[PDB]
mmCIF file of all heavy atoms in Angstrom:
data_model
loop_
_atom_site.group_PDB
_atom_site.id
_atom_site.type_symbol
_atom_site.label_atom_id
_atom_site.label_comp_id
_atom_site.label_asym_id
_atom_site.label_seq_id
_atom_site.Cartn_x
_atom_site.Cartn_y
_atom_site.Cartn_z
ATOM 1 N N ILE L 132 98.735 107.921 80.761
ATOM 2 C CA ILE L 132 99.050 109.330 80.703
ATOM 3 C C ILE L 132 97.859 110.135 81.356
ATOM 4 O O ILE L 132 98.179 111.190 82.043
ATOM 5 C CB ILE L 132 99.441 109.883 79.335
ATOM 6 C CG1 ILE L 132 100.886 109.316 79.018
ATOM 7 C CG2 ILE L 132 99.482 111.347 79.208
ATOM 8 C CD1 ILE L 132 101.277 109.279 77.599
ATOM 9 N N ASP L 133 96.616 109.732 81.077
ATOM 10 C CA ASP L 133 95.434 110.279 81.697
ATOM 11 C C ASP L 133 95.515 110.452 83.157
ATOM 12 O O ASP L 133 94.801 111.250 83.706
ATOM 13 C CB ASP L 133 94.256 109.189 81.496
ATOM 14 C CG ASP L 133 93.500 109.393 80.341
ATOM 15 O OD1 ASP L 133 93.729 110.438 79.510
ATOM 16 O OD2 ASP L 133 92.607 108.565 80.166
ATOM 17 N N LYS L 134 96.163 109.561 83.905
ATOM 18 C CA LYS L 134 96.145 109.571 85.336
ATOM 19 C C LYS L 134 97.331 110.378 85.916
ATOM 20 O O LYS L 134 97.396 110.554 87.082
ATOM 21 C CB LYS L 134 96.295 108.136 85.919
ATOM 22 C CG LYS L 134 95.166 107.218 85.355
ATOM 23 C CD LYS L 134 95.195 105.781 85.790
ATOM 24 C CE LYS L 134 94.452 105.546 87.021
ATOM 25 N NZ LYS L 134 93.073 105.053 86.613
ATOM 26 N N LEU L 135 98.219 110.965 85.047
ATOM 27 C CA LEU L 135 99.304 111.740 85.610
ATOM 28 C C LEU L 135 98.944 113.020 86.302
ATOM 29 O O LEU L 135 99.616 113.402 87.331
ATOM 30 C CB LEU L 135 100.357 112.016 84.432
ATOM 31 C CG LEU L 135 100.958 110.665 83.954
ATOM 32 C CD1 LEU L 135 101.964 110.941 82.851
ATOM 33 C CD2 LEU L 135 101.681 109.970 85.079
ATOM 34 N N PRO L 136 97.981 113.812 85.807
ATOM 35 C CA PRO L 136 97.567 114.976 86.597
ATOM 36 C C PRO L 136 97.119 114.602 87.934
ATOM 37 O O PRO L 136 97.572 115.243 89.004
ATOM 38 C CB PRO L 136 96.412 115.545 85.739
ATOM 39 C CG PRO L 136 96.789 115.064 84.327
ATOM 40 C CD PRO L 136 97.237 113.638 84.583
ATOM 41 N N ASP L 137 96.350 113.560 88.158
ATOM 42 C CA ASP L 137 95.960 113.073 89.455
ATOM 43 C C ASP L 137 97.151 112.635 90.346
ATOM 44 O O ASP L 137 97.238 112.911 91.516
ATOM 45 C CB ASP L 137 94.911 111.877 89.356
ATOM 46 C CG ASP L 137 93.615 112.307 89.010
ATOM 47 O OD1 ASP L 137 93.235 113.493 88.970
ATOM 48 O OD2 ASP L 137 92.732 111.343 88.723
ATOM 49 N N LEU L 138 98.177 111.982 89.773
ATOM 50 C CA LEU L 138 99.295 111.595 90.413
ATOM 51 C C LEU L 138 100.088 112.759 90.899
ATOM 52 O O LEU L 138 100.471 112.823 92.057
ATOM 53 C CB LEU L 138 100.271 110.804 89.477
ATOM 54 C CG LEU L 138 101.519 110.223 90.150
ATOM 55 C CD1 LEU L 138 101.147 109.147 91.181
ATOM 56 C CD2 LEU L 138 102.445 109.639 89.133
ATOM 57 N N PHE L 139 100.193 113.835 90.056
ATOM 58 C CA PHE L 139 100.982 115.050 90.515
ATOM 59 C C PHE L 139 100.167 115.832 91.572
ATOM 60 O O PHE L 139 100.821 116.689 92.264
ATOM 61 C CB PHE L 139 101.320 115.864 89.306
ATOM 62 C CG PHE L 139 102.596 115.371 88.674
ATOM 63 C CD1 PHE L 139 102.674 114.323 87.765
ATOM 64 C CD2 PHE L 139 103.821 115.893 89.082
ATOM 65 C CE1 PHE L 139 103.908 113.853 87.254
ATOM 66 C CE2 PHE L 139 104.985 115.431 88.605
ATOM 67 C CZ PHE L 139 105.015 114.396 87.727
ATOM 68 N N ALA L 140 98.900 115.712 91.545
ATOM 69 C CA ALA L 140 98.066 116.466 92.488
ATOM 70 C C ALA L 140 97.943 115.752 93.892
ATOM 71 O O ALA L 140 97.300 116.288 94.791
ATOM 72 C CB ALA L 140 96.664 116.665 91.881
ATOM 73 N N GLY L 141 98.430 114.517 93.989
ATOM 74 C CA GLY L 141 98.415 113.746 95.262
ATOM 75 C C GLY L 141 96.987 113.110 95.422
ATOM 76 O O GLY L 141 96.658 112.803 96.528
ATOM 77 N N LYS L 142 96.251 112.967 94.309
ATOM 78 C CA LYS L 142 94.996 112.292 94.353
ATOM 79 C C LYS L 142 94.985 110.815 94.298
ATOM 80 O O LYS L 142 93.994 110.175 94.466
ATOM 81 C CB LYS L 142 94.073 112.905 93.282
ATOM 82 C CG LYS L 142 93.808 114.392 93.487
ATOM 83 C CD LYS L 142 93.091 114.919 92.255
ATOM 84 C CE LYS L 142 92.989 116.445 92.483
ATOM 85 N NZ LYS L 142 92.098 117.121 91.544
ATOM 86 N N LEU L 143 96.124 110.190 94.074
ATOM 87 C CA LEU L 143 96.265 108.781 93.983
ATOM 88 C C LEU L 143 96.951 108.216 95.231
ATOM 89 O O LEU L 143 97.870 108.850 95.858
ATOM 90 C CB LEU L 143 96.994 108.311 92.766
ATOM 91 C CG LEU L 143 96.423 108.837 91.445
ATOM 92 C CD1 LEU L 143 97.369 108.245 90.249
ATOM 93 C CD2 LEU L 143 94.959 108.279 91.196
ATOM 94 N N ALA L 144 96.477 107.079 95.705
ATOM 95 C CA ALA L 144 97.088 106.489 96.897
ATOM 96 C C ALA L 144 98.499 105.949 96.805
ATOM 97 O O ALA L 144 99.241 105.993 97.754
ATOM 98 C CB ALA L 144 96.169 105.274 97.409
ATOM 99 N N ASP L 145 98.876 105.527 95.584
ATOM 100 C CA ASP L 145 100.142 104.811 95.449
ATOM 101 C C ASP L 145 100.603 105.181 93.935
ATOM 102 O O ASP L 145 99.762 105.243 93.073
ATOM 103 C CB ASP L 145 99.801 103.388 95.638
ATOM 104 C CG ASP L 145 100.923 102.409 95.418
ATOM 105 O OD1 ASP L 145 102.101 102.797 94.993
ATOM 106 O OD2 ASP L 145 100.690 101.192 95.736
ATOM 107 N N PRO L 146 101.825 105.614 93.747
ATOM 108 C CA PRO L 146 102.283 105.841 92.375
ATOM 109 C C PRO L 146 102.032 104.712 91.363
ATOM 110 O O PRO L 146 101.770 104.933 90.220
ATOM 111 C CB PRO L 146 103.791 106.118 92.526
ATOM 112 C CG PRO L 146 104.021 106.324 93.925
ATOM 113 C CD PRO L 146 102.934 105.720 94.697
ATOM 114 N N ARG L 147 102.008 103.443 91.873
ATOM 115 C CA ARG L 147 101.694 102.296 91.055
ATOM 116 C C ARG L 147 100.210 102.416 90.506
ATOM 117 O O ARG L 147 99.905 101.681 89.599
ATOM 118 C CB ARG L 147 101.772 100.972 91.720
ATOM 119 C CG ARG L 147 103.166 100.505 92.005
ATOM 120 C CD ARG L 147 103.838 99.814 90.872
ATOM 121 N NE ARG L 147 103.094 98.640 90.283
ATOM 122 C CZ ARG L 147 103.539 97.912 89.275
ATOM 123 N NH1 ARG L 147 104.748 98.191 88.606
ATOM 124 N NH2 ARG L 147 102.810 96.969 88.813
ATOM 125 N N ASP L 148 99.381 103.219 91.033
ATOM 126 C CA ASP L 148 98.064 103.395 90.447
ATOM 127 C C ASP L 148 98.001 103.955 89.091
ATOM 128 O O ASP L 148 97.032 103.807 88.417
ATOM 129 C CB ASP L 148 97.220 104.182 91.454
ATOM 130 C CG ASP L 148 96.961 103.474 92.817
ATOM 131 O OD1 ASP L 148 97.036 102.302 92.933
ATOM 132 O OD2 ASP L 148 96.740 104.256 93.858
ATOM 133 N N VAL L 149 99.105 104.503 88.578
ATOM 134 C CA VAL L 149 99.071 104.988 87.120
ATOM 135 C C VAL L 149 99.456 103.786 86.157
ATOM 136 O O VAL L 149 99.225 104.029 85.023
ATOM 137 C CB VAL L 149 99.983 106.179 86.863
ATOM 138 C CG1 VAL L 149 99.678 107.332 87.702
ATOM 139 C CG2 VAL L 149 101.434 105.790 87.033
ATOM 140 N N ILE L 150 99.849 102.668 86.741
ATOM 141 C CA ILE L 150 100.141 101.558 85.866
ATOM 142 C C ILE L 150 98.832 100.834 85.648
ATOM 143 O O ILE L 150 98.131 100.447 86.585
ATOM 144 C CB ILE L 150 101.147 100.519 86.601
ATOM 145 C CG1 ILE L 150 102.476 101.045 86.910
ATOM 146 C CG2 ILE L 150 101.287 99.235 85.824
ATOM 147 C CD1 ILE L 150 103.302 101.245 85.708
ATOM 148 N N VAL L 151 98.493 100.672 84.360
ATOM 149 C CA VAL L 151 97.162 100.027 83.979
ATOM 150 C C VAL L 151 97.354 98.728 83.281
ATOM 151 O O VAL L 151 96.393 98.168 82.814
ATOM 152 C CB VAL L 151 96.281 101.043 83.196
ATOM 153 C CG1 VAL L 151 95.979 102.245 84.082
ATOM 154 C CG2 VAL L 151 97.037 101.488 81.950
ATOM 155 N N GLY L 152 98.630 98.392 82.952
ATOM 156 C CA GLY L 152 98.903 97.071 82.285
ATOM 157 C C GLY L 152 100.301 96.699 82.543
ATOM 158 O O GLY L 152 101.219 97.506 82.801
ATOM 159 N N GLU L 153 100.521 95.369 82.591
ATOM 160 C CA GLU L 153 101.902 94.852 82.857
ATOM 161 C C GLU L 153 101.957 93.505 82.095
ATOM 162 O O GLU L 153 102.114 92.540 82.685
ATOM 163 C CB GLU L 153 102.281 94.760 84.333
ATOM 164 C CG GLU L 153 103.813 94.831 84.621
ATOM 165 C CD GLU L 153 104.165 95.559 85.894
ATOM 166 O OE1 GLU L 153 104.050 94.898 86.933
ATOM 167 O OE2 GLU L 153 104.639 96.755 86.050
ATOM 168 N N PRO L 154 101.714 93.550 80.751
ATOM 169 C CA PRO L 154 101.736 92.292 80.030
ATOM 170 C C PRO L 154 103.041 91.460 80.101
ATOM 171 O O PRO L 154 104.137 92.068 80.057
ATOM 172 C CB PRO L 154 101.492 92.708 78.599
ATOM 173 C CG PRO L 154 102.002 94.078 78.525
ATOM 174 C CD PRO L 154 101.574 94.702 79.915
ATOM 175 N N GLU L 155 102.930 90.220 80.248
ATOM 176 C CA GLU L 155 104.012 89.197 80.146
ATOM 177 C C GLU L 155 104.191 88.864 78.678
ATOM 178 O O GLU L 155 103.293 88.332 78.082
ATOM 179 C CB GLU L 155 103.760 87.964 81.071
ATOM 180 C CG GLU L 155 105.011 87.043 81.051
ATOM 181 C CD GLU L 155 105.094 86.181 82.288
ATOM 182 O OE1 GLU L 155 104.762 86.719 83.406
ATOM 183 O OE2 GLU L 155 105.514 84.992 82.192
ATOM 184 N N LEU L 156 105.407 89.184 78.097
ATOM 185 C CA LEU L 156 105.619 89.108 76.754
ATOM 186 C C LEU L 156 106.631 88.141 76.328
ATOM 187 O O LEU L 156 106.563 87.550 75.233
ATOM 188 C CB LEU L 156 106.032 90.539 76.216
ATOM 189 C CG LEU L 156 104.972 91.596 76.286
ATOM 190 C CD1 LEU L 156 105.466 92.979 75.907
ATOM 191 C CD2 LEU L 156 103.829 91.246 75.380
ATOM 192 N N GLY L 157 107.705 87.982 77.186
ATOM 193 C CA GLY L 157 108.777 87.040 76.740
ATOM 194 C C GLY L 157 110.118 87.494 77.287
ATOM 195 O O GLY L 157 110.099 88.567 77.982
ATOM 196 N N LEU L 158 111.148 86.864 77.029
ATOM 197 C CA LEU L 158 112.491 87.177 77.649
ATOM 198 C C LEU L 158 113.208 88.365 76.961
ATOM 199 O O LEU L 158 113.614 88.364 75.853
ATOM 200 C CB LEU L 158 113.426 85.937 77.617
ATOM 201 C CG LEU L 158 112.789 84.737 78.401
ATOM 202 C CD1 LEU L 158 113.838 83.585 78.275
ATOM 203 C CD2 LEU L 158 112.498 85.050 79.838
ATOM 204 N N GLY L 159 113.569 89.347 77.855
ATOM 205 C CA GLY L 159 114.296 90.406 77.525
ATOM 206 C C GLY L 159 113.654 91.616 76.744
ATOM 207 O O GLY L 159 114.325 92.110 75.802
ATOM 208 N N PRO L 160 112.488 92.003 77.119
ATOM 209 C CA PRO L 160 111.850 93.178 76.357
ATOM 210 C C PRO L 160 112.641 94.373 76.442
ATOM 211 O O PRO L 160 113.044 94.794 77.532
ATOM 212 C CB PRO L 160 110.456 93.291 76.973
ATOM 213 C CG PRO L 160 110.323 92.109 77.965
ATOM 214 C CD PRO L 160 111.693 91.586 78.301
ATOM 215 N N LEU L 161 113.010 94.985 75.319
ATOM 216 C CA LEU L 161 113.786 96.167 75.298
ATOM 217 C C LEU L 161 113.115 97.461 74.801
ATOM 218 O O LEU L 161 113.372 98.580 75.359
ATOM 219 C CB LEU L 161 115.023 95.972 74.519
ATOM 220 C CG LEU L 161 116.015 95.024 75.184
ATOM 221 C CD1 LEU L 161 117.287 94.974 74.222
ATOM 222 C CD2 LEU L 161 116.481 95.573 76.619
ATOM 223 N N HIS L 162 112.295 97.448 73.702
ATOM 224 C CA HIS L 162 111.773 98.656 73.128
ATOM 225 C C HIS L 162 110.428 98.293 72.532
ATOM 226 O O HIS L 162 110.142 97.142 72.117
ATOM 227 C CB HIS L 162 112.751 99.081 71.997
ATOM 228 C CG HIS L 162 114.012 99.761 72.520
ATOM 229 N ND1 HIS L 162 113.944 100.976 73.102
ATOM 230 C CD2 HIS L 162 115.276 99.428 72.445
ATOM 231 C CE1 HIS L 162 115.179 101.345 73.424
ATOM 232 N NE2 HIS L 162 115.991 100.468 72.987
ATOM 233 N N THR L 163 109.559 99.366 72.313
ATOM 234 C CA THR L 163 108.235 99.126 71.762
ATOM 235 C C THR L 163 107.878 100.147 70.768
ATOM 236 O O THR L 163 108.246 101.371 70.924
ATOM 237 C CB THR L 163 107.205 99.242 72.958
ATOM 238 O OG1 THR L 163 107.521 98.226 74.004
ATOM 239 C CG2 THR L 163 105.784 98.867 72.437
ATOM 240 N N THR L 164 107.163 99.821 69.770
ATOM 241 C CA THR L 164 106.658 100.665 68.723
ATOM 242 C C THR L 164 105.093 100.363 68.372
ATOM 243 O O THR L 164 104.592 99.403 68.944
ATOM 244 C CB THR L 164 107.558 100.722 67.444
ATOM 245 O OG1 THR L 164 107.346 101.910 66.717
ATOM 246 C CG2 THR L 164 107.394 99.429 66.654
ATOM 247 N N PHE L 165 104.609 101.124 67.422
ATOM 248 C CA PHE L 165 103.072 101.198 67.295
ATOM 249 C C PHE L 165 102.702 101.173 65.839
ATOM 250 O O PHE L 165 103.336 101.875 65.086
ATOM 251 C CB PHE L 165 102.563 102.368 68.099
ATOM 252 C CG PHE L 165 103.003 102.413 69.505
ATOM 253 C CD1 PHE L 165 104.096 103.231 69.796
ATOM 254 C CD2 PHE L 165 102.543 101.682 70.493
ATOM 255 C CE1 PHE L 165 104.681 103.294 71.026
ATOM 256 C CE2 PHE L 165 102.951 101.621 71.716
ATOM 257 C CZ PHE L 165 104.158 102.380 72.014
ATOM 258 N N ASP L 166 101.677 100.472 65.445
ATOM 259 C CA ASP L 166 101.060 100.558 64.150
ATOM 260 C C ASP L 166 99.872 101.509 63.891
ATOM 261 O O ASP L 166 99.454 101.678 62.772
ATOM 262 C CB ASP L 166 100.688 99.072 63.676
ATOM 263 C CG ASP L 166 99.596 98.425 64.494
ATOM 264 O OD1 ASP L 166 98.964 99.019 65.472
ATOM 265 O OD2 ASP L 166 99.504 97.130 64.343
ATOM 266 N N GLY L 167 99.508 102.208 64.921
ATOM 267 C CA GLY L 167 98.350 103.098 64.825
ATOM 268 C C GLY L 167 96.992 102.326 64.742
ATOM 269 O O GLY L 167 96.015 103.035 64.580
ATOM 270 N N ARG L 168 97.032 101.074 64.875
ATOM 271 C CA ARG L 168 95.834 100.123 64.826
ATOM 272 C C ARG L 168 95.541 99.572 66.202
ATOM 273 O O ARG L 168 94.594 98.728 66.285
ATOM 274 C CB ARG L 168 96.005 99.059 63.796
ATOM 275 C CG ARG L 168 96.379 99.569 62.400
ATOM 276 C CD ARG L 168 96.198 98.591 61.273
ATOM 277 N NE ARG L 168 96.906 97.353 61.428
ATOM 278 C CZ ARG L 168 98.145 97.052 60.851
ATOM 279 N NH1 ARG L 168 98.726 97.940 60.190
ATOM 280 N NH2 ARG L 168 98.609 95.826 61.036
ATOM 281 N N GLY L 169 96.230 99.997 67.249
ATOM 282 C CA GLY L 169 96.012 99.507 68.527
ATOM 283 C C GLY L 169 96.954 98.399 68.992
ATOM 284 O O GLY L 169 96.889 97.936 70.121
ATOM 285 N N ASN L 170 97.918 97.962 68.112
ATOM 286 C CA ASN L 170 98.891 97.022 68.461
ATOM 287 C C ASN L 170 100.302 97.799 68.858
ATOM 288 O O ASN L 170 100.611 98.814 68.321
ATOM 289 C CB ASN L 170 99.154 96.079 67.374
ATOM 290 C CG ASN L 170 97.866 95.354 66.959
ATOM 291 O OD1 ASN L 170 97.241 94.698 67.844
ATOM 292 N ND2 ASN L 170 97.432 95.595 65.683
ATOM 293 N N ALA L 171 100.952 97.131 69.780
ATOM 294 C CA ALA L 171 102.362 97.398 70.113
ATOM 295 C C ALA L 171 103.156 96.288 69.587
ATOM 296 O O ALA L 171 102.719 95.141 69.483
ATOM 297 C CB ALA L 171 102.475 97.658 71.598
ATOM 298 N N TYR L 172 104.412 96.627 69.260
ATOM 299 C CA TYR L 172 105.369 95.659 68.840
ATOM 300 C C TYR L 172 106.585 95.870 69.727
ATOM 301 O O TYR L 172 107.117 96.987 69.782
ATOM 302 C CB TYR L 172 105.718 95.786 67.359
ATOM 303 C CG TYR L 172 104.560 95.707 66.400
ATOM 304 C CD1 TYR L 172 103.667 96.726 66.336
ATOM 305 C CD2 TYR L 172 104.433 94.602 65.606
ATOM 306 C CE1 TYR L 172 102.620 96.683 65.451
ATOM 307 C CE2 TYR L 172 103.390 94.592 64.731
ATOM 308 C CZ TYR L 172 102.401 95.558 64.713
ATOM 309 O OH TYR L 172 101.378 95.461 63.829
ATOM 310 N N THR L 173 107.060 94.795 70.288
ATOM 311 C CA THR L 173 108.186 94.852 71.317
ATOM 312 C C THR L 173 109.281 93.876 70.978
ATOM 313 O O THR L 173 109.056 92.745 70.652
ATOM 314 C CB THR L 173 107.559 94.559 72.715
ATOM 315 O OG1 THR L 173 106.663 95.628 73.072
ATOM 316 C CG2 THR L 173 108.676 94.534 73.814
ATOM 317 N N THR L 174 110.497 94.303 71.120
ATOM 318 C CA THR L 174 111.707 93.449 70.890
ATOM 319 C C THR L 174 111.862 92.686 72.153
ATOM 320 O O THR L 174 111.886 93.127 73.326
ATOM 321 C CB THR L 174 112.906 94.314 70.553
ATOM 322 O OG1 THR L 174 112.938 95.293 71.537
ATOM 323 C CG2 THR L 174 112.904 94.843 69.205
ATOM 324 N N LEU L 175 112.173 91.375 71.935
ATOM 325 C CA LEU L 175 112.598 90.485 72.979
ATOM 326 C C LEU L 175 114.041 90.083 72.668
ATOM 327 O O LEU L 175 114.367 89.284 71.746
ATOM 328 C CB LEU L 175 111.737 89.290 72.998
ATOM 329 C CG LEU L 175 110.226 89.528 73.147
ATOM 330 C CD1 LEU L 175 109.457 88.153 73.052
ATOM 331 C CD2 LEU L 175 109.945 90.189 74.552
ATOM 332 N N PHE L 176 114.986 90.651 73.429
ATOM 333 C CA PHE L 176 116.401 90.575 73.185
ATOM 334 C C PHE L 176 116.839 89.026 73.286
ATOM 335 O O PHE L 176 117.589 88.494 72.518
ATOM 336 C CB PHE L 176 117.211 91.458 74.101
ATOM 337 C CG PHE L 176 118.687 91.448 73.831
ATOM 338 C CD1 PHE L 176 119.321 92.075 72.850
ATOM 339 C CD2 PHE L 176 119.447 90.516 74.683
ATOM 340 C CE1 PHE L 176 120.764 92.052 72.653
ATOM 341 C CE2 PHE L 176 120.851 90.510 74.518
ATOM 342 C CZ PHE L 176 121.459 91.159 73.481
ATOM 343 N N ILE L 177 116.383 88.356 74.389
ATOM 344 C CA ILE L 177 116.853 87.023 74.782
ATOM 345 C C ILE L 177 116.124 86.026 73.906
ATOM 346 O O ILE L 177 116.797 85.143 73.400
ATOM 347 C CB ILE L 177 116.756 86.826 76.255
ATOM 348 C CG1 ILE L 177 117.670 87.794 77.027
ATOM 349 C CG2 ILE L 177 117.062 85.405 76.744
ATOM 350 C CD1 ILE L 177 117.301 88.024 78.522
ATOM 351 N N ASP L 178 114.805 86.126 73.761
ATOM 352 C CA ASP L 178 114.068 85.206 72.889
ATOM 353 C C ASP L 178 114.321 85.506 71.383
ATOM 354 O O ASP L 178 114.084 84.655 70.584
ATOM 355 C CB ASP L 178 112.561 85.308 73.216
ATOM 356 C CG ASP L 178 112.186 84.448 74.495
ATOM 357 O OD1 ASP L 178 113.011 83.580 74.818
ATOM 358 O OD2 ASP L 178 111.067 84.745 75.022
ATOM 359 N N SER L 179 114.944 86.689 71.092
ATOM 360 C CA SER L 179 115.243 87.010 69.734
ATOM 361 C C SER L 179 114.104 86.990 68.826
ATOM 362 O O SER L 179 114.000 86.403 67.708
ATOM 363 C CB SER L 179 116.380 86.092 69.126
ATOM 364 O OG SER L 179 116.976 86.785 68.030
#
């Protein structure tokens, strides 16, 4: 979210420069939630 002002200003070379992580998690990720402790929790539809 920090990088969005720069993106909208044309200060980034490539829109993918706002992507800062692309974790490989498992089959069929659908939705993510948060514990407020720095963890995300994601549903894997296919891996169940």
Side-chain angles (χ1 to χ4, degrees):
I132 291 161
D133 266 358
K134 303 176 92 97
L135 297 177
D137 285 349
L138 188 64
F139 275 83
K142 293 175 189 189
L143 307 177
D145 178 354
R147 288 275 306 176
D148 294 333
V149 301
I150 299 285
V151 298
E153 204 150 75
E155 184 155 323
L156 294 178
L158 299 179
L161 290 183
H162 282 293
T163 306
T164 200
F165 312 95
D166 62 10
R168 306 194 306 263
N170 304 302
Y172 299 73
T173 295
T174 49
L175 304 177
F176 181 84
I177 294 163
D178 280 343
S179 201

